[PDB]
Write a protein that binds this ligand. Structure first.
Ligand SMILES: [K+]
Ligand SMILES: [K+]
Ligand SMILES: [K+]
Lengths: 250, 250, 250, 250, 250, 250
């Protein structure tokens, strides 16, 4: 194989320059499925890769796994393999009152609550999305009539304390992170997720384009247990938008 | 007066909700004079304010002074008088080889090399511009057929050591900043200037919209001395672009 | 399922209170297969879980994924299912001249070059292993006549820049990390890997026991390409040592 | 002009080695006015410069503008123009109960709540005044019978949140700065202002002398709306002291 | 003398490779006294040194004085004088409910609340004990039937605020340290003392072995005034254990 | 005894409110012996205390030990016995070319390269001396016709790496401190020593007065080995200056 982790060769990519990067390997196929010529390429660790065809052009789809570490690996290997553009798609929880389940969030930049973005650029540097990518994502969201919020995302290296969850084994949050949510909510932060700070930092500081869309599945300020159908729907809308954006970016 | 520093009353703004914010109080008159019915409002400290009218709406032009401190005042005091949108206009030195004299840079976000942004958000929070304002700026630039780079700016609390100038009194740069320019250059940083990190972080964390455009008057990678007329042609061009962006944000 | 990510119920563990936690979901089956009555429990994301039986007691094997983020999930969700003891097994590159291919390293504590450990304890808090688990690991190694180094490991949120690899896309290392390897080498650091800083800090600060062993497959100070069989002989050897340590911790 | 910002030539200085540096351009003339041969030299941005004569010796007076950024520029340019000594004069609010409106504060050193002092020396370095300057200021304060307190000043890059003002657009203070005032007051800090940390750091670490006096116009622990007369008086007393000190330092 | 502070020559050591390092000079003789051939060697500053004989082998005993600064000196000089192993012995206050007066604490690693450990290794590095030393100390504690807890110690550069004492001149604790104890107690920290973070950091990062035992004289969660007899007893038990460990390490 | 460490009662001080605080317990007797009616009070640890009488007032001499930890104890415990003024006396190495052997340095403030100052004030807070004590010290020096430099001192938690000494066991300096001396030298730092950062920050933030004088025994820029008599002549000279300053502060 041409790289240490993902188990891909250059040839396998057939000239692809754009990759869509969910976190869940399980979602790779679902996104592959919207375009033409879907083919599983490899499954190793958290990296499930398919290739596909979008208007006669190769496009990759590759899971990052959870967290900046597994993400930094998958970007690095995919870049060594000719991918210049990287679109993340997730599902996510809102942290603002006016966001509703099923709205879409396009991320301009991320609060760097991770460790891997530091290995690319010191904390002062902005975890910012590429303008091209963010635009394609906004317009793509319009072309299917999504309700879209455009804003800052908090990117955490933990699911539990760094997002201020308290229904845990310990039930405590270390002092640094205790009451941090109120701050990010006062500062108009939209949601939490766990791989954008890595993603956007590494791409901005190395000349690669990157962007992020997500669909809202819960709102923690008015928190409802998500309905199976609705999650599924929200997922395909986000999936679709990120494909439409891919199409504009090719 | 209604505010501590600016010497303005709520009535002076006649309902204005958009401010164009250059650094130099000299530039204020120039920019107001491109719009309809300009009237000087006030002048105190580094803060020079004019009111004008664009497509029938009141619009403010207000100078910030150099640096985050005086910016943070201007923005806070305009905000109390009803400004919701802040558009910074400057001229600037590029640090990339591919940007030329006469180009225009629109800033997605800034490297926060300043002290005042921290008094609004901790360093991990992105100094990111408003998407609508960024979009208007780039569209306005394309509308006059500008060559325009869109990306990241390093926002420094000093002109001299923080941008590694060494033709100074001491000729010395502190350790922390010696070699830093090469870092920002490796990382695709376009330019330096001295108010965006403050402006964009305070805005983004407070629900106000901000963006920034600048025209390039020197490249430090291939550095020529500018003649005045080029400066002026370059200032007029960024000025027209900022007023066209204001148009689309009204 | 009882937990957000792992796809496990309390009943699946049949009372298990010890988890062997490799990084790669492939290794899970291998390790369970060395114990009695292995049964696959679940597989979702980077998390592959098996149950087995050792000296008549239930024992879990669960993969963490690469990096602190996904580790912190695994550990938290196992912990809610009753795991009190966590033993990480890996293969690794040594950065010291005196450690050879085929040796075994047991980790006392780790250099916290990751983001997730901070979401449990501030940086001053030691990423230290449990004394009993450390003791069992080293005893188990001596029991098969391993050559075994016991000391400090550098735990990195990246594979590439954080371990100063320069045969990458950019070929660049950020300032903070360029020259860092030589520092860890001066300081007697044995190896790098990517989950221990998280694992050991979250464990030690939450009342759970953790340790880590790894077998050496390359030395970067005298670096040879490994052949597969050596890898496999080396993986089997660390695997047998981890199961013998589990024995003594039951 | 011989410098980038201030619009001065060497010759214009007529051999001056000492500068007095209020923040308000409006105050420049008022200070010039106490000595002989007052002459406006230039007005550009926040930099209003006069020269004057003190016992047959040239002395400059130059506003810095608000904040360490504009201050660092004016010191750098004035130093390139032969100024070795720099006296700041302001008006200020006390934060200690026993200080009264119209007392004088001479600053020994400043709490570094700014960004520009870091561009000269890392945060560990003391923002300390020169002993000569601080002495001249103490004795000058005596020669007109001021009530003087001699102590530490907190130097903030913001007027509003970093001084813990809550009557703002947002009414909030970010977590770092919320409750910081109580700490500085517990630590015997005298007052807040916004340019000494820059001033004293840059001068101490580059072999220039610098000192700071201020007159008290409000006491925030017992806060009264300042009376126009009294402010005017307090201003001329501070102005006078700083001139007397200049005279001793020449 | 062969070193700057301790007032020893190489010869004086007679080939000694292991040193026991209490903090109190007064305790040096008491520890010397358990072995053979006790001889005072020197008394300068806080450094009281005796030599002695343990199974026909030279062993040093040398007080460090309070705090990482005096400790770093005594390790450095003793290392230049051929000491490779360094055992600390103290008496200490527990901060956990289940620890009792007269139990023994062996330290695996220390929370770095000091300044001198930074002069050897940046804060990320673990202040970890050597495995050999920690083992000898555990087993030595067993060979005299101590009740032993094995865990993390918080190492403070102050006795008073950094251990959250409030019966002081000022009665206040600076904001950083106010409520830090609750955090270290939530994180299973055993006790506070003032020289292990220096000790273990300098030794781990320079190839020297080091370990720490202490005996509990007070429990601050259930705080009793210590009884003279019991303190004396606890001291000799700790003293004995650390000698037994020395014997295993020779 | 009234205090935990010093072995003093309130009565022992006979009303003393000024302490001269050398580092070395040997120097205590020397300094008391220059005043009237010296009597040894106590000796425990690095703390040696004498009482004497100067112009009819009781005065204490008390040793601090090397480093902030033991300093912070001494100062706290003296403070509880009524000491309000603390004057440190030392001998020291200069790092500037223009300071010679036999000169005297009086310290305005210190570079806080220690851990204990933080347990009183965060790093941004200046390690600044009391103005009255600084003034007395410099006046006393001029009164015996000392050559005297007045400026900034770097206060280090280590003798060896923190002052970049490389004739050590490892011969290595950690990254953070390698090259740091050249920085302090560029910045006009006079000397290094190991207790002032603690002393001055704890004093200034607690309402106590402190200053420091030292006589120069080596210059590391042109370094000669000192002969004893020069040391002694130099110690007597700083000692006389500190007692003359005490005179003027009584
Ligand atoms: K300004
Ligand atoms: K992962
Ligand atoms: K000491």
């Amino acid at each position: 194989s041409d790289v240490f982790h993902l188990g891909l060769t250059k040839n396998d990519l057939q000239g692809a320059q754009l990759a869509i990067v969910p976190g869940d390997p399980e979602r790779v196929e679902k996104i592959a499925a919207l375009m033409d010529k879907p083919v599983k390429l490899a499954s190793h660790r958290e990296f499930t890769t398919w290739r596909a065809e979008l208007d006669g052009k190769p496009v990759i789809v590759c899971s990052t796994g959870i967290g900046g570490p597994s993400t930094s690996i998958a970007v690095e290997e995919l870049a060594q393999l000719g991918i210049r553009t990287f679109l993340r798609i997730g599902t996510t929880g809102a942290i603002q009152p006016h966001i509703n389940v099923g709205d879409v969030l396009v991320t301009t930049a991320s609060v760097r609550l991770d460790g891997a973005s530091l290995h690319f650029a010191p904390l002062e540097f902005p975890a910012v999305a590429d303008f091209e990518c963010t635009t394609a994502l906004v317009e793509a969201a319009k072309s299917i009539g999504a309700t879209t919020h455009v804003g800052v995302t908090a990117s955490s290296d933990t699911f539990y304390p760094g997002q201020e969850r308290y229904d845990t084994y310990s039930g405590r949050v270390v002092r640094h992170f205790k009451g941090s949510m109120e701050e990010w909510q006062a500062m108009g932060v939209m949601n939490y997720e766990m791989e954008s700070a890595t993603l956007l930092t590494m791409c901005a500081s190395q000349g690669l384009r990157a962007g992020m869309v997500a669909g809202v599945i819960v709102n923690r300020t008015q928190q409802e247990i998500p309905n199976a159908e609705t999650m599924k729907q929200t997922e395909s809308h986000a999936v679709k938008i990120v494909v439409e954006a891919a199409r504009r970016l090719l």
